[PDB]
């Protein structure tokens, strides 16, 4: 399906999942959210835009916050992803996040992922990634990064809510900000603001991508 | 109080009479595209 790309970096894959080991040779994987999974990832200009001012309150403010990052640019690196998450799933559990990126440039990149409540940072995961040459480009992979305990707790609490509409009510004030940076130059390669609802679709998890624009 | 309190977050929806979280404008009331609320 649709993914996100700036001039310097393309995110081809993103997934968060729960993997259960039934026995040493049998694994069951449930995807909560996914980009570039059920169909090959792509990027094209047929994107619609969202006024970034409409979402500033849902993300960290001040120096290094969303407004500061957007103002510093480049504007073509900024996206809003809405996920309709698939929460229908059941020691031997592993909660993971995987992602993959491509660039024409050989860089050392840093990926900062901030989980936010009412626009306030609760936890941050920071990962450093080196390039691998592949089919005429450089690839970067975060493979099966353990989901932090806050998110495991959050998902447990969500599933313990008696009604699905309650889950949506909680999700309205839960956001994730992903900022991928060239470590040396500090250039913003990708900045993705994530917003969530629960999926009601028979096909499971879904996503919509929007460009973020000034007005 | 603390805005990042995970228990308070969920208590607000489970037991609305005791909700102690920031009040906000629901996404559905904001100037956002129609697609934003219609899954594909
Ligand atoms: C802890 O390490 C924070 C890093 C967060 C990674 C993003 C995972 C995306 C969460 C999707 C689950 C959906 C729950 C509604």
List keywords for this structure.
heterodimer; A: 215 residues; mainly beta; Coagulation Factor XIII, Chain A, domain 1; 7-stranded mixed β-sheet; 6-stranded antiparallel β-sheet; 3 helices; 12% helix; B: 40 residues; mainly alpha; Virus Scaffolding Protein, Chain A; 1 helix; 0% strand; binds myristic acid; Transcriptional coactivator YAP1 (chain B); Transcriptional enhancer factor TEF-3 (chain A)
What can you see in these coordinates?
It is classed as transcription. Keywords: transcription. It forms a dimeric assembly. The complex is a heterodimer of chains A (215) and B (40). Chain A is mainly beta. Chain A has a single domain (1-215), classed as Coagulation Factor XIII, Chain A, domain 1, CATH 2.70.50.80. In chain A, 12% of the residues lie in helices and 51% in strands. Chain A has helices at residues 66-72, 149-159, 164-171, and strands spanning 4-5, 10-23, 26-35, 49-51, 78-85, 93-103, 108-117, 120-130, 132-134, 137-146, 174-182, 188-198, 206-213. Chain A has a 7-stranded mixed β-sheet, with helices on one face. In chain A, strands 1, 2, 3, 6, 9 and 10 form a 6-stranded antiparallel β-sheet that branches. Chain A starts with a strand and ends with a strand. With 40 residues, chain B is mostly helical. Chain B has a single domain (1-37), classed as Virus Scaffolding Protein, Chain A. Chain B is built from 1 helix and no strands. Chain B has one helix at residues 6-14. Chain B is elongated. The A-B interface holds A 48, 50-51, 54, 57, 82, 84, 117-118, 120-122, 150, 153-154, 157, 161, 166, 169-170, 172-174, 195, 197, 199-201, 206, 208, 210 and B 3-4, 6, 9-10, 12-14, 21-22, 24, 26-27, 30-33, 35-36, 39-40. The complex binds myristic acid. Myristic acid (MYR) is lined by residues 16, 32-33, 85, 97, 113, 115, 123, 125, 147-148, 150-151, 155, 176, 196 of chain A.
């Amino acid at each position: 399906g649709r993914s996100v790309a700036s001039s310097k970096l393309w995110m081809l894959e993103f997934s968060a999942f729960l993997e259960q080991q039934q026995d040493p040779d049998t694994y069951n994987k449930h995807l909560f959210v996914h980009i570039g999974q059920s169909s090959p990832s792509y990027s094209d200009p047929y994107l619609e835009a969202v006024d970034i001012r409409q979402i500033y309150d849902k993300f960290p403010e001040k120096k290094g916050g969303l407004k500061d990052l957007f103002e510093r640019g480049p504007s073509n690196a900024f996206f809003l992803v809405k996920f309709w998450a698939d929460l229908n799933t059941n020691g031997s559990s592993f909660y993971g996040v995987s992602s993959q990126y491509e660039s024409p440039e050989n860089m050392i990149i840093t990926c900062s992922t901030k989980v936010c409540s009412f626009g306030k940072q609760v936890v941050e995961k920071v990962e450093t990634e080196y390039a691998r040459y592949e089919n005429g480009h450089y690839s970067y992979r975060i493979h099966r990064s353990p989901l932090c305990e806050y998110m495991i707790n959050f998902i447990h609490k969500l599933k313990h809510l008696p009604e699905k509409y309650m889950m949506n009510s909680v999700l309205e004030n839960f956001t994730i900000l992903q900022v991928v940076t060239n470590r040396d130059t500090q250039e913003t390669l990708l900045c993705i603001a994530y917003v969530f609802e629960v999926s009601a679709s028979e096909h499971g998890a879904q996503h919509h991508i929007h460009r973020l624009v000034k007005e | 109080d603390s805005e990042t309190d995970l228990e308070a977050l969920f208590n607000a929806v489970m037991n609305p009479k005791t909700a102690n979280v920031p009040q906000t404008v629901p996404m559905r009331l904001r100037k956002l595209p129609d697609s934003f609320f219609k899954p594909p």
